[PDB]
Symmetry: D2
Subunit: 333 residues, 4 copies
């Protein structure tokens, strides 16, 4: 077993834990957060959007047991202090949100971990990886890697096909997003000064920034600088949709050419559908991106075309499945 | 000059138009028609989940109800041609049922004795389709049946007008992010119009849906006919919507702040401008047809190329209803 | 195969369909609603709260296929017209909400069905059955049966235990309910004149009446007229909680006696839990009622008022109960 | 002007600010929180459930201006450090949730404030006040007062009438509550170890404890220890309902007697309705409690009656209006 520790037993940490239970040879030996074993065990077992955990969870004092397997729990807000050397950690899933930087995340390496995979975009000389778009950039010598963002994971395969098959000139993105835990429950001061994330998460359409389209070049260099865009955060608790509006090089692009090109590029990470689904239908899915042929649009005036595509993603589980694929790749090669 | 109005369909738009007409001198609602008793109609006027309590006094009689001592006749006739409009001397019917959205169908009110019909939606037939303060001057006063267009068209037209007049519109795609409406189901259930997406629980989903606001924009601004396309995403807010517009303009050295100034200069009673980081509930109850949001403006350029992106808020209920009542008052005068 | 037809392919119809797939020897041969095969197939496949249907659904013209099994679909708003004699229907699950009366439901028997199980409380000389509380009242001769209500199904096993083990004197109930399709999406005239169910379902706490406590005597006669209560419908799309506040005959009762008594009575229909769960955590569960030991309260002044709470997925909890009763009714 | 400062510009602080604008001779001169002026001004101006603030708000550096009136803003997490002596504060509305104790709240008095009114239940030798039920307990010598809870404010006038008119034997309460800011937006570790408040606030029915019924004796002593109950927190962002199930001393009570007794006791703090309203209809209302005659139930077996009533409250504005009435009463005594 590849010995994994999860730092930050949040939405992404707990779902990565559930996902790892379904992946042979991957094992979570340790978990770190800021609370007691009873609260960690409870939130693994019960999950508002993702459902009950099928396995048996029981609290001990080391931490908790899952199907007889013991998971050590810790409460260390500073990652350098974690006993990773004593537990022989191979890879930390860094899912706190507070170590989104190569140097900060190095704390886990000091602590005795062999490698750190960060469950978000991160600053520093790091590779930023979307599984099945650029995971092959990983050579096995990396110490600290970023798993990029949920949006980037919905967007990169779509953008890669658009550029490979048609040539991407430029594009603007809107992602329509499930609200997340960095948003307040009720209108209140926001810790990062964001006057929109300050607002009641579940009662608003809230515009917000994203670096997914601006920083796409980190996963596909060829289209670096060719995209921009923002998010609208809306009151569903998970499940999201990326809409992309592009100018292509080819000007006799068609709705069929785009769909077929997406269908043909599909894999475990990039799915394809022609059903008139809605956001609830993608909750718990394991594609990093699900291309929706029903939303494809080509607009033309005189000769010039504007193309528009949409892809679904469960910002939780789609992203988590991608993260676990990358983990598994990083542990093996 | 008490212009005598009858409201057909005392629904979201009908009730709100009633409330609006109380605030507008010389407009009077003498009659109301729906499919339920006076008690139910009076109660829904008094109490409104999103728009708040009606300030006036409402009491139930049998002719119908009284509002501030003024008697309103109420009827329950599913067939408009049977309504006693000749006996009540109706000047104008606000047709707000959703079941007469066609010139010939709506003519049923004219047969019944009404002088004019204004339809609270897009409508088929040789009709004028009007966005107040964009093309209300197309009305000459001879019209028998007029369409007040859609909520989305009212949010979009003044933005698109400015973009074309000041920059030249080449082409554009739209996404409106919409509050759910009463044509959507409470729970997943057979939909009456066979729509597999409006079939789904309205308040638990991001729901792609079609709209004609962009495609049919030429009905209100002919110069840009066929230059726009796009759709909607219905999301779980009960009212308050956002129109996002991604355009190619003729001019190519355009900047964020050129665009924002051009909108601010075109602002009026129907077309608001804001630079505050607001969210959807901040527009609930507002009486602008469209509220341009300078904080959302984006210009994306690669090489030569520019894609421009703008956003305008609207309360699909009250924004639309103030527009409808302005057109009503113009049509009467 | 017991040959079932589902009248009304709604929340309860479709979920009974799903449930019947998991149940050997039960088969849905036909389905009736007010829409096309395309819509019906789609809604079976995709479900906002209950998740994707695992099987394969494909539309045909007779109706649709589910894992290669053909289901005939119909569009008859009048049940007496349905070709139940031609299809040899054993039992109809009447799930429209429009035949909730023995005589009205008889329309299916006219049509050629042998039996009708109504997915709701119903008026008439009918048995009203909560599986595992009073299903043994069914002799097999019954023509039209009621499966009672979701709330009744949540309440009956709790109330039975309280009476058998402590003696029930009187009780008030509040059920906190997921909103349902009889509520409006937006404030609008309500077809039954209910000024509260008129209101936007997902934006309000909405008081509403319920006969679960008042008509509890229909399933447990011994406590007839000893309960009353209402509902508060709130903005979750499924999952509900029944709170019961009671006077017991015994007065030295404690939290830990109450919870033990509940745990001992647990079965296929009546679950027990000591986890601090919330409504989400019961979505899709198949217990008719999940007693929550963490909510038990004993209040006393001088010489007691007792308070308990049970979860239920008003959808799946009720459906599962309905399919158990179906299966029991077929097997007599 | 009575010079007021608001410690904690949260839900209750901002709404009390907005309420104080509507009340002549009450003036907010200073505000304290943990953020900048830009965020404080913005959140006053825009309010998801209570709507846009009608007045003009503009940011300055001392703080912000509201209709030309300057409000000083601060960012001091420790209250004793606040310059209350320099600004001559008469009363602090203590609305942080972190000073709900007489001794802890004394920090404002050390700072130079004359009196502190805590927007919550509080421990210590404090009077706990529900305006129009027991505000006459205040003599004007009090240093630190509690304004009780939103539930207590919804409940006390109802319970007072039931006891005065019929004699209260015992009762159980369930309040069905709007979710609040001590709940998590998504399932996540809770700071107070509460495994239910840990869950996604807007996706769940969440049982929770409340002291409103148990601690009713603090505001009406005669019925001390006669009530108990809990809450169910549900996905509305504001607006709540108290249900009260009671045994009364009188046993021939009817729906009609109960409803009349409630109607006769109505005032600026305790409203009465016979309309089939729902929670949204009470958002922004200024009654502390709105009795709902449509929900009154009398259940009887043989001779034994159980009575059930319900009262609405905007846990936000019903509470805030009660708080400001108490504020004004406290200011207009010594
Ligand atoms: N929720 C999403 O849709 C999603 C999707 C993609 C990426 N991400 C990223 O994953 C990261 C976590 O997001 P999330 O939604 O799970 O947040 P949530 O919040 O969970 C984070 C957990 O980390 C814990 N934590 C915080 N600081 C800690 C510390 N110093 N030491 C140990 N534990 C600590 C918290 O207790 C919480 O349990 C963020 O970077 C986020 O941007 C989230
Ligand atoms: N966001 C919006 O709510 C919005 C915006 C712009 C336009 N509209 C248009 O306004 C119209 C009404 O929409 P709504 O949202 O108010 O819906 P609604 O359901 O609230 O109202 C329609 C009302 O008319 C009644 N009615 C239906 N058929 C009738 C008949 N034949 N005779 C008399 N009364 C009848 C219904 O009982 C209901 O009260 C629709 O065409 C809609 O597209 C709605
Ligand atoms: N929580 C719950 O959903 C719940 C729980 C238990 C029982 N019930 C009861 O079950 C029944 C259905 O409730 P639901 O929530 O599934 O409703 P629903 O609205 O989702 O389903 C009813 C279906 O019947 C169809 N229908 C209506 N009239 C018809 C007719 N005349 N002929 C054929 N089809 C018709 C409708 O199109 C709809 O699909 C009701 O009696 C209800 O009170 C509901
Ligand atoms: N929300 C309700 O329904 C309700 C009703 C009645 C009473 N209350 C009580 O009012 C108090 C606050 O409630 P809320 O709902 O307004 O919470 P809230 O979190 O919205 O607002 C509290 C504010 O205080 C600020 N704050 C925290 N610590 C501070 C520090 N010590 N110094 C300065 N400012 C600080 C926070 O930044 C926040 O803006 C609590 O005691 C609560 O129990 C709440």
């Amino acid at each position: 077993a590849v010995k994994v520790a999860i730092n930050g037993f949040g939405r992404i940490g707990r779902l990565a834990f559930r996902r790892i239970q379904e992946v042979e040879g991957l094992e979570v030996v340790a978990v770190n957060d800021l609370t007691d074993d009873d609260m960690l065990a409870h939130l693994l077992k019960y999950d508002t959007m993702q459902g009950r955990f099928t396995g048996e969870v029981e609290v001990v004092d080391g931490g908790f047991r899952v199907n007889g397997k013991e998971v050590k729990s810790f409460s260390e807000p500073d990652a350098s202090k974690l006993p990773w050397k004593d537990l022989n950690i191979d890879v930390v899933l860094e899912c706190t949100g507070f170590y989104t930087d190569k140097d900060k995340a190095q704390a886990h390496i000091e602590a005795g971990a062999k490698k750190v995979l960060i469950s978000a975009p991160a600053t520093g000389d790091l590779k930023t990886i979307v599984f099945n778009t650029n995971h092959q950039e990983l050579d096995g010598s990396e110490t600290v890697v970023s798993g990029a963002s949920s949006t980037t994971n919905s967007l990169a395969p779509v953008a890669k096909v658009l550029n490979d098959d048609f040539g991407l000139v430029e594009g603007l993105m809107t992602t329509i997003n499930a609200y997340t835990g960095d948003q307040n429950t009720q209108d209140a001061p926001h810790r990062k000064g964001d006057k929109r994330r300050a607002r009641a998460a579940a009662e608003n359409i809230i515009p917000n920034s994203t670096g997914a389209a601006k920083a796409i070049g980190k996963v596909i260099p060829e289209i670096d600088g060719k995209l921009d865009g923002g998010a609208q955060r809306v009151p569903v608790a998970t499940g999201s949709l990326t809409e992309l509006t592009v100018v292509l090089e080819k000007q006799d692009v068609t709705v069929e050419q785009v769909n077929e090109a997406m269908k043909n590029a599909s894999n475990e990470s990039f799915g394809y559908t022609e059903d008139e689904i809605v956001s609830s239908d993608v909750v718990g899915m394991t594609y990093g991106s699900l291309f929706d042929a029903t939303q494809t649009r080509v607009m033309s005036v005189g000769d010039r075309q504007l193309v528009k595509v949409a892809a679904w993603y469960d910002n939780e589980m789609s992203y988590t499945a991608q993260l676990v694929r990358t983990l598994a790749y990083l542990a093996e090669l």
